[model samples]
Target: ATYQVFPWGTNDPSKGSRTIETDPADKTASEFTWQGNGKTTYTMTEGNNGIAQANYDGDNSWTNDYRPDAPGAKFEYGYSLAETNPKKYIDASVTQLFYTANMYHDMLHALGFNEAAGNFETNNNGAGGKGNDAVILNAQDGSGTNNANFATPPDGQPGVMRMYIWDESTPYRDCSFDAGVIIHEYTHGVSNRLTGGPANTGCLNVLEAGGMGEGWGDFMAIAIHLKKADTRAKNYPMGDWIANDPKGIRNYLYSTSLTTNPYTYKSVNTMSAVHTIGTVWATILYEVLWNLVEKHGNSEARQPTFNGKVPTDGKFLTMKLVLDGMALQPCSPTFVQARDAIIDADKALTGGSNACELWKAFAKRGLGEGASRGSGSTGRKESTTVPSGVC
Candidate 1:
């Protein structure tokens, strides 16, 4: 079987490429085995019933059976999670492929988490304090349901990630095709696992921490794209295909300048929704990412050639530090605590070389020195003045 490298999603064709492994028989290709944490596993069935026997056969091909309006148009896709018979497949279209690639991506995120925690045996379930494994279900819900999420592993259950395929009112769409959504969901595992131990899901229980969780998801998604050789713009949007909006599903693009997005730390409570509040934190991280890229270089010379691999580029360096910072955060950390952790991560990784630039970026976002430290609550407004600190 030939290996296919699909674009990030159906949207921006200029983003990144995810080289998919077509052969399910190949252990390294389909089943990614991480050190200490074991391997990642997933199944695409007719529905979202977490059972191993319902796994679909490894037949990576396209079909035109579902979309009758398209007539002869054949989309390269796969069956959903509801399929019962191995011979029979659902017209879920690409749900299997998304699950395969996304599970691998989530594994990479786990590796980053392990690195941040300074342990390769970082288990997700905290069992024996070893690296934990993951199980995923693609097309967790039926078509026409607009949603995707990552759920922590409860008793007798493993950590699971779910992606939905829906009808776009006019045409059938899949969230699996969107790399942003995949990465966003995957990063949730990283943040949730690294913070307050892998087994503890309550660390991000509060409103502000929950909002930051969303921000971290967006940060990882955009960072993955920015490290690509074909990425044209640094300030790209997210959820383009899922939300059908070129500007993403957020209120604004993650811009560095205040003119484009003037969100600050104090503006967290002003936004009622967690996703909306996340935009502010994501914008701040985006500025830090771009600032580091500008100082080092925008060359894609060090970009990873395949999906599920970590890049060594300047952008990725920042990403690694951010991941490490997440590991350093206290349980349910406030915005300031997260910021300080990033500073500490920089110090640990770069010997404080980028401290000035990092501080400047935070200061521009009103998170610098002397900034009012709120309770990390989403109840009321706090100080709005940008903190005064650099170097």
Candidate 2:
């Protein structure tokens, strides 16, 4: 029989809550423990699917009563544990539950959080009325409890990572099921924590450079995967797994292929809708990075478009510089600022021929010749498709 869980509801005993809780500890990050009852299963009765029903502010009421201090405390503990057990979490597979744990730790390290710095801390003791570090766990049924919040946030401030699992049987089965999705979301949490959670305030309801955030998550998953398995050695380079149905492991790199990424028409476009745009954008970024590395001999000295000082060779340094640029991007701004920020951060870290020129080259690919002067609109071309408000 398959086990199931509903968001914000009591745990189901048949599923073995204790087992789920202990599983993370047993597999990786022992200090990283689950707060709620283990072995419990929740039932979603209101929404049509798991995504529609999952809630952080208690069951249906949308208030912080259930996890008032949990969010704040979660940041504190999660950061601490990240620093203490950094190596235990580092891995390449996007399917394993612990795979995200590794990505989270690596992202923190990318932000310069040493094992000795007491980990990263929230500015206001995590009581600024902001829902930071929010984690969402989806039911196994793929019921689409709460349709909103499927994409992950950018790297800057540290916060909770929502985990969306379809069901016990349909849940993550290695690096497959929900592993990719979970790691993608977790990567955002890592990015937020490293930077200051780049400005989200903007007019016209346009999303902040959050897509860049999502792109980074994709980068992390792909880069880590490539570094581990040498996927590029075979036909598989880097991309989404959706296209690799049976023969290939779900992955994609950078290309102009529209079918490479997918988007769901059923949902609205306001940061809530699903689509292939992310994968496409991710491909663009990936190609840019790959070009820089390949062109420059993939050495530790080649500067990237973003953090100019940080070379594109080292995985951790590249991440830091990239995330730094994202943090510096203007609220709801274009990707130029993100690119510039990376260059600037690298210069600050290692002054020299920062080679920000490479970044300019990468920008040119998407922004065009006029982009050389650092001027471009955020408007998406016909090649790009998605809901108006969806990020």
lDDT top scorer = 1
Query: Could you tell me the lDDT of residue 38 within candidate 1?
Result: 31
Cα lDDT, model 2, residue 377: 34
Best by TM-score: 1
lDDT of 2 at 283: 54
Error of 2 at 169 (Å): 11
Which stretches of model 1 miss by more than 4 angstroms?
1-111, 115-132, 154-157, 227-234, 299-312, 375-390
The models' CA-based lDDT, in order, is: 0.56, 0.34
- Supply the TM-score for candidate 2: 0.49
List model 2 lDDT by residue over 1-391, tens digit each.
0111110111112212211121222112112222211223222111100111123232323232222121212211121111322222111111122223433443443354322222222221322322222233322212232211332333222333333322222222212123344546555554444444423323102332555556666665554433322222222232223222332222343443324433211111223311233443455555545544444334321112334445445444555556556555554444445555666766666652434433443443453223322223323322222213211
* TM-score between model 1 and native: 0.71
Clashes of each: 18, 69
Per-residue lDDT, model 2, residue 121, is 22
